[PDB]
Amino acid sequence: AGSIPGRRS
Amino acid sequence: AGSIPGRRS
Amino acid sequence: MGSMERASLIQKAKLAEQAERYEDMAAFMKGAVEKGEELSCEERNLLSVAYKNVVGGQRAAWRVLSSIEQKSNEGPEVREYREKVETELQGVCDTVLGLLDSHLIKEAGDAESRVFYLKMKGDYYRYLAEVATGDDKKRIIDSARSAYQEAMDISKKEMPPTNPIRLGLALNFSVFHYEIANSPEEAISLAKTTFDEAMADLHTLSEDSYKDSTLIMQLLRDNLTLWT
Amino acid sequence: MGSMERASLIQKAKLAEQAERYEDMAAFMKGAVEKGEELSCEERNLLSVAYKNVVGGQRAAWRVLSSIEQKSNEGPEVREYREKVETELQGVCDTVLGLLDSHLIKEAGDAESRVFYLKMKGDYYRYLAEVATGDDKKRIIDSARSAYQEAMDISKKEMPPTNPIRLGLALNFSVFHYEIANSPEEAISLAKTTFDEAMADLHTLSEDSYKDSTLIMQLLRDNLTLWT
Ligand SMILES: *Cc1ccc(C(=O)NCc2cnn(C)c2)cc1
Ligand SMILES: *Cc1ccc(C(=O)NCc2cnn(C)c2)cc1
Numbered sequence: 001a002g003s004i005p006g007r008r009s
Numbered sequence: 010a011g012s013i014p015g016r017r018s
Numbered sequence: 019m020g021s022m023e024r025a026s027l028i029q030k031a032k033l034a035e036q037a038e039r040y041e042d043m044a045a046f047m048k049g050a051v052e053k054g055e056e057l058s059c060e061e062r063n064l065l066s067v068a069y070k071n072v073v074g075g076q077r078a079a080w081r082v083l084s085s086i087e088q089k090s091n092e093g094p095e096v097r098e099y100r101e102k103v104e105t106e107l108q109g110v111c112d113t114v115l116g117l118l119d120s121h122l123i124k125e126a127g128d129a130e131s132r133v134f135y136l137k138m139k140g141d142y143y144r145y146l147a148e149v150a151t152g153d154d155k156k157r158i159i160d161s162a163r164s165a166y167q168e169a170m171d172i173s174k175k176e177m178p179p180t181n182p183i184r185l186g187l188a189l190n191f192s193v194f195h196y197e198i199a200n201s202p203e204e205a206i207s208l209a210k211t212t213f214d215e216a217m218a219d220l221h222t223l224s225e226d227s228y229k230d231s232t233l234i235m236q237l238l239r240d241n242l243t244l245w246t
Numbered sequence: 247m248g249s250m251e252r253a254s255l256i257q258k259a260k261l262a263e264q265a266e267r268y269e270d271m272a273a274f275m276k277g278a279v280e281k282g283e284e285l286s287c288e289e290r291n292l293l294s295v296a297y298k299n300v301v302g303g304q305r306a307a308w309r310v311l312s313s314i315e316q317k318s319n320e321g322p323e324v325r326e327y328r329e330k331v332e333t334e335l336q337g338v339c340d341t342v343l344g345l346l347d348s349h350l351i352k353e354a355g356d357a358e359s360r361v362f363y364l365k366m367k368g369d370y371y372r373y374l375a376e377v378a379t380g381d382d383k384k385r386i387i388d389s390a391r392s393a394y395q396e397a398m399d400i401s402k403k404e405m406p407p408t409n410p411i412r413l414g415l416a417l418n419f420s421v422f423h424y425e426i427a428n429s430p431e432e433a434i435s436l437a438k439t440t441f442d443e444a445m446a447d448l449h450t451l452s453e454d455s456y457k458d459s460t461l462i463m464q465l466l467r468d469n470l471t472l473w474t
């Protein structure tokens with residue numbers, strides 16, 4: 001289950 | 010140009 | 019970071035993100051917050067991206083070690099090292115929560131900032147809950163739920179159903195319900211209602227806003243597909 | 247790490263590698279080295295893998311920042327932050343070199359350990375040379391060359407041409423020639439002769455040794471393809 005990716009700015 | 014990957018043990 | 023200019027801290031946070039130096043990025047953004055001024059939309063994103071990456075690495079490592087530890091209970095080293103990583107993770111979560119409490123949230127009056135910070139508060143208590151096992155797992159879960167709920171209430175009143183902050187908040191609260199609170203029905207209901215109400219609002223958006231919202235709606239759909 | 251058992255340090259280094267916690271891995275292996283006992287083949291690999299990953303992240307970040315810095319010279323923040331990363335990288339290289347000098351190399355008598363450590367010495371001076379710009383770039387380059395050369399001399403006398411340590415040493419020395427010493431002809435000649443002499447020795451190997459050697463020979467071939 002995926003949360004929101006705070007991957008890239 | 011690639012050196013030796015000390016990637017995994 | 020008290021001797022560095024606020025603008026220099028922000029500029030170096032952006033450089034650190036480009037260099038994938040997220041520990042540095044977080045320390046720069048922590049310094050920027052401690053200057054005491056409110057954060058712009060872009061600056062809030064930098065703060066969130068930095069700590070999300072740092073704690074994301076710690077969570078991934080903790081899960082690897084916790085899995086090894088459980089396979090061994092079917093010397094003290096595996097437990098000791100899992101404990102060390104867990105303590106470091108809790109320290110990072112406590113640091114972020116301290117920044118929100120001193121004093122980001124109390125000065126955040128606009129919906130876009132206040133909902134963003136309260137979602138953050140819910141997220142970092144959720145990360146604490148992931149590793150909690152003692153007399154305070156319940157209180158940590160309730161702290162996460164309370165922050166998410168206040169953010170939810172504001173976002174329903176003040177933001178359109180397609181707002182990316184509102185959508186990402188609902189996504190993470192639904193993950194909270196499913197993974198932390200043992201409420202998969204609430205998780206599925208929230209994700210479905212969030213998706214459907216956003217779908218009905220898409221006609222109001224520009225091409226660029228449409229892409230932003232549909233991207234996050236796909237994440238809700240992916241979870242629903244996994245959960246049903 | 248003075249209060250932790252050597253065996254516990256080794257065990258935790260292996261756990262850290264599984265968790266991709268390479269900074270921890272390096273600190274555990276540094277503690278193991280400082281116990282003063284020689285390292286086994288497996289333990290030497292753990293030491294090398296840990297620091298290779300740590301400095302590999304720093305080199306990647308330094309290149310990102312150096313590229314930004316050069317695009318700006320066509321405030322002081324980009325230079326300052328590149329300098330900070332560069333100083334941290336140099337500290338890691340100095341730490342590894344200190345471990346080799348106190349006292350890994352002087353106690354290493356077998357070809358497999360001595361060549362391995364001297365190749366390491368060449369590698370970490372090569373990393374120092376990558377960022378060197380002052381009155382000591384020449385001396386750093388000569389320190390790398392001297393370590394590689396001593397390792398080369400031992401490996402020719404004591405190891406078969408397919409030995410993976412010998413092959414990886416020649417690979418990295420050829421990269422030294424090409425990238426650091428401005429000697430692309432020497433780099434190409436070394437890679438070609440290394441490949442050809444290994445090819446002629448493959449018939450002596452088991453199925454598993456054959457896979458180990460041909461894998462590294464492919465890396466020599468990839469470089470030759472890029473260089474010619
Ligand atoms: C709280 C929060 C909401 C939304 C975002 C966001 O827009 N992240 C970018 C993104 C959109 N779709 N993906 C996969 C990433 C961040 C934080
Ligand atoms: C100095 C040194 C020599 C050889 C190796 C090694 O065998 N690394 C594993 C490997 C083989 N082929 N690839 C891509 C990785 C490490 C260090």
Ligand SMILES: [Ca+2]
Pocket residue numbers: 023024
């Ligand atoms: Ca100022």
Ligand SMILES: [Ca+2]
Pocket residue numbers: 251252
């Ligand atoms: Ca002991």
Ligand SMILES: [Cl-]
Pocket residue numbers: 098099102258
């Ligand atoms: Cl530990």
Ligand SMILES: [Cl-]
Pocket residue numbers: 056125126127128
């Ligand atoms: Cl305000």
Ligand SMILES: [Cl-]
Pocket residue numbers: 030326327330
């Ligand atoms: Cl800096």
Ligand SMILES: [Cl-]
Pocket residue numbers: 284353354355356
């Ligand atoms: Cl010895």
